[PDB]
Homo-oligomer: A and B are copies of this chain.
């Protein structure tokens, strides 16, 4: 029989031990240790120089936690007690108790410099200011996860009688605006793999029936999530809700398989923390405990790469066997052009709506454009070698720089395709007319 749970992102179960992590992210991590019927909570940072690490005794059993650059929020799901602790001492630590119905429990909490949110098993949404003053109350499908950035908030909802779904909204000073509300989520539930209920796995899924390791906004403010498919998913076109679509941008199983030399090693797992441009920030976990353990390892990094390869063909092309596979130029150029295109489009959306957030992204986009045309030129040259005039000409239309078109003319001459040379220069004339206009 199914059962609802309280949850916090990137924390861990106890296993059999007396300690666990409540939540973890690129700014820091929260850990706790059991001291008889009392608990010690510690807030740690990946910049302890800026932010004092601090610890205190939890006499309440806080089972919910949220960490940001200003403070840490704690909650007790049964009693409804909550507590906020700023990292500084300019702002006070403060506590509050939230009303709860019989059998109702707080399922998730979130806090930003401009908004605070609480959710419950009976689908009630409550919002507050940074002092705990209430703003509003709303009724939804049951809420199972929350995350936020400035006024932007992303929520996940689930019921057997309404399905699995999400909401995207911005709690602006004008009003709460819904981009999407309780729209179906295209993510594989862990219980689809019903037969994998081994003892070590069963503890984790009793701790986290949803299976999701984390959910967060990108460095560019885009929603992202990592599920039981061991794949990182990113929501594209979220700023344009008519056009929104989820993209699988990185599979950890494929990467670890390749990194092992194309081998099925059952021994290493990835714990995600945050996505920064093209690179996932994550912790590498090993062995039966698929959740990270104590002492916490040092963070690692991994690049996003598109799911566009076949294992058997990769092994045959590769044919020191543990060294990562040698990928053909065709496959490499293919994935490069797709990844360049995806990254350029997402960054374009970022800059067109929110501007330069770091002050250099124009350079990144220019570099991506160069990589894109160079990838296409590799694929074009391969097509010319195959003498497929139509496919070669189709690829020519996708280039962006007249330098690349000129290089394509040279390649066509080397390929001895005068018809293709003529048609490419017709395209260059057409683009020159477009450049004149």
Contact = CB atoms under 8 A, between A and B. Distances in A.
B243 A131 contact: no
A391 interface: yes
Given A161-B163, A162-B163, 13 more contacts: A80-B310, A99-B308, A122-B188, A134-B338, A137-B306, A137-B308, A138-B245, A141-B184, A141-B186, A159-B163, A178-B243, A179-B242, A182-B184
A221 B244 CA distance: 24
Contact of A99 (B159, B179, B310): B310
Interface of A: 80, 91, 97, 99, 122-124, 129, 131-134, 136-141, 159, 161-165, 175-179, 182, 184-186, 188-189, 233, 241-248, 306-311, 313, 334, 338, 379, 388, 390-391, 394-395
B123 A186 contact: yes
Contact of A242 (B80, B129, B177, B379): B177
Contact of A163 (B131, B163, B388): B163
9 contacts: A91-B390, A131-B391, A137-B306, A137-B338, A141-B184, A159-B163, A161-B163, A175-B243, A176-B245
How many copies are assembled?
3
A419 to B, nearest CB: 14
Max chain B Cβ within 10 angstroms of own Cβ: one of A139, A141, A308, A394: A139
A313 B97 contact: yes
A116 to B, nearest CB: 13
A138 B247 contact: yes
A430 B308 CA distance: 59
A134 B334 contact: yes
A394 to B, nearest CB: 6
Nearest to A308: B99
A186 B141 CA distance: 5
Nearest to A99: B310
A341 to B, nearest CB: 9
Contacts of A165: 162, 184
Contacts of A182: 184
B248 A124 contact: yes
B161 A388 contact: no
A329 B308 CA distance: 64
Contacts of A134: 308, 334, 338
A92 to B, nearest CB: 8
Leading 10 A-B pairs by shortest Cβ distance: A162-B163, A131-B391, A162-B184, A139-B246, A99-B310, A178-B242, A161-B163, A139-B186, A161-B164, A139-B248
A332 to B, nearest CB: 14
A138, A163, A164: residue with the most chain B Cβ atoms closer than 10 Å: A163
Contacts of A185: 162
A137 B136 CA distance: 40
A338 B136 CA distance: 8
A388 B133 CA distance: 12
A186 B159 CA distance: 10
A334 B99 CA distance: 13
A395 B184 contact: no
A307 B99 contact: yes
Contacts of A390: 91, 131
Contacts of A80: 310
A213 B411 CA distance: 50
B306 A133 contact: no
A243 B138 CA distance: 12
A394 B390 CA distance: 63
A239 to B, nearest CB: 13
A243 B184 CA distance: 18
A231 to B, nearest CB: 8
